[PDB]
Each structure stands twice: as structure tokens, then as C-alpha cells.
């Protein structure tokens, strides 16, 4: 029951710009059944980096790519949920982390981050719509204006308006 180990993007599937990349699909019952086969990677002529579940056609679509791969695009759909394997979503930062899209949602000192769509505890104007491509979803640490400290978030502690999250540099030698 591994569905809680993927990063969920609602109302979304990915489209094969490229004719070259490949796909598996199976009609099924629940998105769980979909996690488990991506997690286990059985019966797949490729590495499962993401799956979509189609709540209307009850289908799973397992992918050897994700939303960040070249020659692939998101497509909208009320019936689609996308789930990307945390293993192929880069979990360190490059530079100041303008493009960090990992799922760490805790500040350096352990404070659970406050949702970008929320104004509680803290009022702010970093609307997700005002920052498209900067993936200000859920309560993830993000550095949307690409500032000095790397990814930060508003804090769910009313006494701490914000704080850096402590995410490692990919390469600093």
C-alpha cells in the first residue's frame, strides 16, 4: 500500500510529445493497485518513474518519465491524478534552488511548513497562481524568487513567520 510515497498532482496527466518514449496501461479498480505495480516495477519493460490513475476509465498509465522529463507535457483533466516517484524527483538543490521540486516540507528547526494556499498562521502574497512553474503546491519548501538562502516556507508556528529548509546542495566540493 505505497500510494503515500509518491508526490500527487491533482487533475493531471502527461502527454507523449515524443513518439519515441513508451507506456503501459491497464484497466484496474483503485489507484493503490497502481502505486504497488509502479513501486514493485513488475511486468514493465522500463523503469516506473510515474503513474497516472484515470478515475473515469479506471486505467493506470505507468511511465518511464515524469513531468520534468524532456519531450513530455502536462495535460489537464478532471479525471486524472498524477503520481511521481520521489526517487526520480531530484532531492537536492542546484544553486539557490529556484527549480527545486522535491517534497520536503519542514523548516530547519523542525517546524511543519504552512500551505502556500493558506493565510494561516501567516498572511502573505505568494499565491500559487502568482508563481506558476515555481510549484508552490501543498506546503513544500520553495525558493520562488530564487533568493540567497535556498528554499524556505511560511511556518505553521505563529511565532515564526518563515524559515529556511535545510535541503542539501547536489554538489559543493
Ligand X SMILES: O=S(=O)(O)CCCN1CCN(CCO)CC1
Q: Summarize as ranges the residues that interact with ligand X (CB under 6 A).
A: 124, 147, 149, 152, 161-162, 164
Residue closest to ligand X, measured at CB: 149
**Which of 167, 168, 169, 164 is closest to 109 using CA atoms?**
164
Whose Cβ is closer to a copy of itself: residue 107's or residue 114's? Answer: 107
Pick the binder of a copy of itself from 50, 60, 89, 136 (CB under 8 A): 89
Cell 506558476 belongs to 132
**Cα(161)–Cα(166) distance, integer angstroms:** 17
**Cα(39)–Cα(123) distance, integer angstroms:** 39
Partner from ligand X, a copy of itself, none binding residue 99, C-beta < 5-8 Å depending on class: a copy of itself
H-run or E-run covering 84: strand 73-85
Interface residue list for a copy of itself (CB under 8 A)? 5, 41, 44-49, 64, 68, 86-92, 94, 99, 102-104, 106-110, 112, 165-166, 168, 170-171, 173
Amino acid at each position: 500500500n505505497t500510494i503515500h510515497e509518491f508526490k500527487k498532482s491533482a487533475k493531471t496527466t502527461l502527454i507523449k510529445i515524443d513518439p519515441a518514449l513508451k507506456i503501459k496501461t491497464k484497466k484496474v479498480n483503485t489507484a493503490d493497485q497502481c502505486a504497488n505495480r509502479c513501486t514493485r516495477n513488475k511486468g514493465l519493460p522500463f523503469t516506473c518513474k510515474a503513474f497516472v490513475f484515470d478515475k473515469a476509465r479506471k486505467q493506470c498509465l505507468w511511465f518511464p518519465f515524469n513531468s520534468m522529463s524532456s519531450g513530455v507535457k502536462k495535460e489537464f483533466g478532471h479525471e486524472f491524478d498524477l503520481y511521481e516517484n520521489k526517487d526520480y524527483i531530484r532531492n537536492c538543490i542546484i544553486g539557490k534552488g529556484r527549480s527545486y521540486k522535491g517534497t520536503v516540507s519542514i523548516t530547519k528547526s523542525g517546524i511543519k511548513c504552512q500551505p502556500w494556499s493558506s493565510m494561516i498562521p501567516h498572511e502573505h502574497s505568494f499565491l500559487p497562481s502568482s508563481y506558476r512553474g515555481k510549484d508552490l503546491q501543498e506546503n513544500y519548501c520553495r525558493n520562488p524568487r530564487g533568493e540567497e538562502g535556498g528554499p524556505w516556507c511560511f511556518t505553521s508556528n505563529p511565532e515564526v513567520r518563515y524559515e529556511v529548509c535545510d535541503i542539501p546542495q547536489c554538489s559543493e566540493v
